[PDB]
Amino acid sequence: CSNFFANHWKGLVVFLVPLLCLPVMLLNEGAEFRCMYLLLVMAIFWVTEALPLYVTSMIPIVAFPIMGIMSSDQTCRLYFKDTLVMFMGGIMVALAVEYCNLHKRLALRVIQIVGCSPRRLHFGLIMVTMFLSMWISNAACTAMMCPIIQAVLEELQAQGVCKINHEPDEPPYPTKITLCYYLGIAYASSLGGCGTIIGTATNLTFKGIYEARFKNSTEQMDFPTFMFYSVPSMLVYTLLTFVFLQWHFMGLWRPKSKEAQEVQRGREGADVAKKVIDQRYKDLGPMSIHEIQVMILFIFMVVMYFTRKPGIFLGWADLLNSKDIRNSMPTIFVVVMCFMLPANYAFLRYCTRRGGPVPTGPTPSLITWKFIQTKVPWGLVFLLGGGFALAEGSKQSGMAKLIGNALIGLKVLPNSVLLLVVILVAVFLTAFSSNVAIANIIIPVLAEMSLAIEIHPLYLILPAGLACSMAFHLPVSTPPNALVAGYANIRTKDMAIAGIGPTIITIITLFVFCQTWGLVVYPNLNSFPEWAQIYAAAA
Amino acid sequence: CSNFFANHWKGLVVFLVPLLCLPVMLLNEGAEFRCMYLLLVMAIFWVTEALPLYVTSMIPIVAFPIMGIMSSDQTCRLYFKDTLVMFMGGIMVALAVEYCNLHKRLALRVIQIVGCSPRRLHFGLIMVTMFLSMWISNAACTAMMCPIIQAVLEELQAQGVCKINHEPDEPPYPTKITLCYYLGIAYASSLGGCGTIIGTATNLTFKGIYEARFKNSTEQMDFPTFMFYSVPSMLVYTLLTFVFLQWHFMGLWRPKSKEAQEVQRGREGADVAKKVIDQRYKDLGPMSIHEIQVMILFIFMVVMYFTRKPGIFLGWADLLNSKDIRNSMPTIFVVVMCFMLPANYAFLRYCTRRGGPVPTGPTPSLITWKFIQTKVPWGLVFLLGGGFALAEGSKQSGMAKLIGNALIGLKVLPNSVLLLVVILVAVFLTAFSSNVAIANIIIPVLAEMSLAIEIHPLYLILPAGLACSMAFHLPVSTPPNALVAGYANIRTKDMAIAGIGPTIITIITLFVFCQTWGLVVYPNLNSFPEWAQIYAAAA
Ligand SMILES: CCCCCCCCCCCCCCCCCCCC(=O)O[C@H](COC(=O)CCCCCCCCCCCCCC)COP(=O)(O)OCCN
Ligand SMILES: CCCCCCCCCCCCCCCCCCCC(=O)O[C@H](COC(=O)CCCCCCCCCCCCCC)COP(=O)(O)OCCN
């Protein structure tokens, strides 16, 4: 009966996909094809969720050493990379923020500012997340903003606006409002990361590749110039993504259904919302030393990130350059200082004798370890590490050169068709791997092809470089996606269905504003500059 | 003001110890001394638990890049090493055993074997852990045995013979019987790991070091001779450790409250306990397919552990030699298979058309990720990776070489005094670091030192090599202690107080059986062999 395929399809996928994909390993000899078999099987498992994502990410530990691609000691060391430590520490700091109930105060403040309208709050949070991710790592901003969204949605639930999770092992199903807000936060982080060189590591990666490959090039990826090029498109597809997400979940253009909850809130969100919200903000009372310390540490951590090799002034990484200190150090420092510092300071009454009451016990610190263990989604370690290790295995096993050579054959296509196909290929490749890895795979081949067919290298590289960050479909596509799927349990199916929109929006906007606005930014993009001719003649 | 110390001593230590230890950094200029300061502060925090051990273990991530010892990326990747992946996977496999309630079945079987007497069960469990750790890694055996010990304690408590936990934010305080059993398992693993050259990585490490420095040596530390030397002493001090644990946590030689409970529970442990246990075992149905598959996978994992590069015969790691598999593949493979393999296998009724109820849904795997996240102590990742990171930073910064050069000055002592002091130093050093790291630090220095004087190199290397695994005082001294502390919440003070017994017992036992039995196993140990004379002359 069809019920067998309806119920055990996950097990059928698990049992059959390796056997069905075995021919790619059998009919070809090099280790590139063994690694391609592994990648294809892992991607198929990721898409269908035949196994838990965290479990599927464990597969490289078994596959790589057996296939001879890398040693098991190396493969495990590719997990728990520096950026993974940064992500985990950021989650810990967000949990510390939540523990002192600072997130509730911040959410009350922002709702008091905006006006308790779910559409207006959604727009404001999306815009602030985009502007913030313009300067800080995307996953850092996502882990930052998850508790704020949780508190805002909790307040909306308290006002009767909506239900956070669907009413009933399997974790609770998030509601369309919850999906909208969280997916919007993730998408805003991803989009805002592209507006500035500091915005994400992919921008630095392909900017450095372009600079090293092409010296004496008239057109520069200077810090203000890159912003001038990217901010218009960034804003345009950010607003378009916000409009699409509102249409997909809250029925912005559809009054038939799914807008009733927001329409209801709009009718009764005039004055009762204001009174309840400002009374509740009065209820919390003055800012306690607990929240003061947590907020001071948080602001310190954010600034400490931002001043690490910004490129516009001497960051603290240029100082203390004995060893390469990356952004994991400040985060773990904040996590440790959370435990080291106390939360009362009431014990000073011993020396001062001014205060009457005495704690009569050990004063609790800013956070407890049992809180961290209970709330941290520890599987994200395996998921993000698996992404990094899969990227490294793709580098070493030779998949990189294979895909790069496969990309060369597109020389026959015309100019605009070539640009569109390159953007599509970049999006498709970055859907299944770390963004920096995909940029490393794709950019040099694009540069050589551009020199081959007499095209300005930027005309192909820069749109493709920005497209490498357009990851919106799977939790494994980019760390913000994994963080959102972990903080609020979000399934992959509806996530990909939602992300089918921003992909098209970003592709179209990037193509259009390349072809039009890049000429304004770079007057000689369409033509072939002299230095490009010199490099082509040399090669 | 005494209550001020009595209530705020932990944070006072936190605030004062770095300032008091700062002269270590200020007075001496080398980076080895900065690393020494970091290690001293971390050790002081470890001993007093002024911070949670997991939080203290995070300190290297911040400290090493700041002091220039190592880069941030390398320090973070030192954590979650291959061996730590093995340990965490072993914990996950133990959880898989627990989920199918196999641990209760095994505990009931053992109770039937021995006869429901806590003294006799403790003795039997200690000896079984001994024998199994003779061939497998100590941490693997500890993770294996922890669920079985939990099950047997639960069965005893259900008989009403003992209480697992004391009466009640902090985790429950374990009772005397729980401490006795768990510390017995940890100590037995650590002891039995020294019986055989395969028992622990430290044995292979110092055997390889000795074989490298000295070649053409008539005395061989091969598989049979090493066992012949080690088994008698290992038996003696493990029996003495069992006696000490019985004497301390219970009243074996003292008439105490613990003596009364043991005898009163042994009075009803003759036939009534046997009948009750047999009935309880028969209450469990026939060993089901879920437990069948868990047992098969577990036995396969153990066999892969043992059959991976043993000296006796050619192992599976010798083939597939493109990359060194190094034991991480079997454990993660077992975890993955536990997630893939079904449990009921009743779905096959469709193809067979035999008949019966149908699943009406997906058949669950052997384990669930929610159970893994809830029960795995994830701080163990930081705690165990801290040891590896600290060892690597110590050897790169030069602390290890500093300690080795410091130990040279002991050559003025007489031979017996030299042996005693060397064993004491080895125990004290291994109390604060990984056993392999301590062996790498001390053994070559010991070899050169024994060449300097006219002393057989084995006479010093082998006793100290065995002693390097004699760590029983702190959870950070050796992985089994950390796993036992994580599984059952054992405060560092209790384990430190229990560690005097095994420490003194093993020190005296090693002294006596070296000086006596080593002559029988290795004749001419007292004298100076010709090859040693040639090696000393060539210096
Ligand atoms: C050394 C490398 C090879 C190792 C091979 C190990 C084999 C171990 C023994 C396998 C025993 C099971 C064999 C199939 C049993 C009958 C399957 C019936 C059809 C089917 O798939 O039903 C599902 C069960 O699948 C299942 O039971 C699938 C189980 C997992 C099979 C994985 C096979 C991997 C092969 C890899 C080969 C690699 C070669 C190159 C290196 C229903 O499942 P459900 O939906 O009810 O539940 C899903 C989990 N919750
Ligand atoms: C890298 C350093 C960065 C420093 C940045 C500025 C920090 C400013 C604030 C520091 C603390 C100000 C004083 C607070 C009151 C202390 C009173 C005495 C100690 C005391 O009562 O102990 C606990 C409070 O400890 C505490 O309050 C301990 C606070 C943390 C001290 C950390 C010292 C690090 C020194 C690093 C030196 C590096 C040198 C490099 C050349 C009481 O609490 P309790 O024990 O009852 O309960 C468990 C804790 N909640």
Short mmCIF file of C-alpha atoms in Angstrom, two decimals, chain B residues 12 17 25-26 177 381 389 423 477:
data_model
loop_
_atom_site.label_atom_id
_atom_site.label_comp_id
_atom_site.label_asym_id
_atom_site.label_seq_id
_atom_site.Cartn_x
_atom_site.Cartn_y
_atom_site.Cartn_z
CA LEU B 12 37.27 36.20 47.29
CA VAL B 17 44.34 34.49 43.28
CA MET B 25 54.43 36.81 35.29
CA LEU B 26 56.13 40.00 36.50
CA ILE B 177 27.58 4.07 48.55
CA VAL B 381 33.77 18.91 25.99
CA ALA B 389 44.91 22.63 25.03
CA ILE B 423 57.20 8.28 41.59
CA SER B 477 43.62 14.63 36.40
#
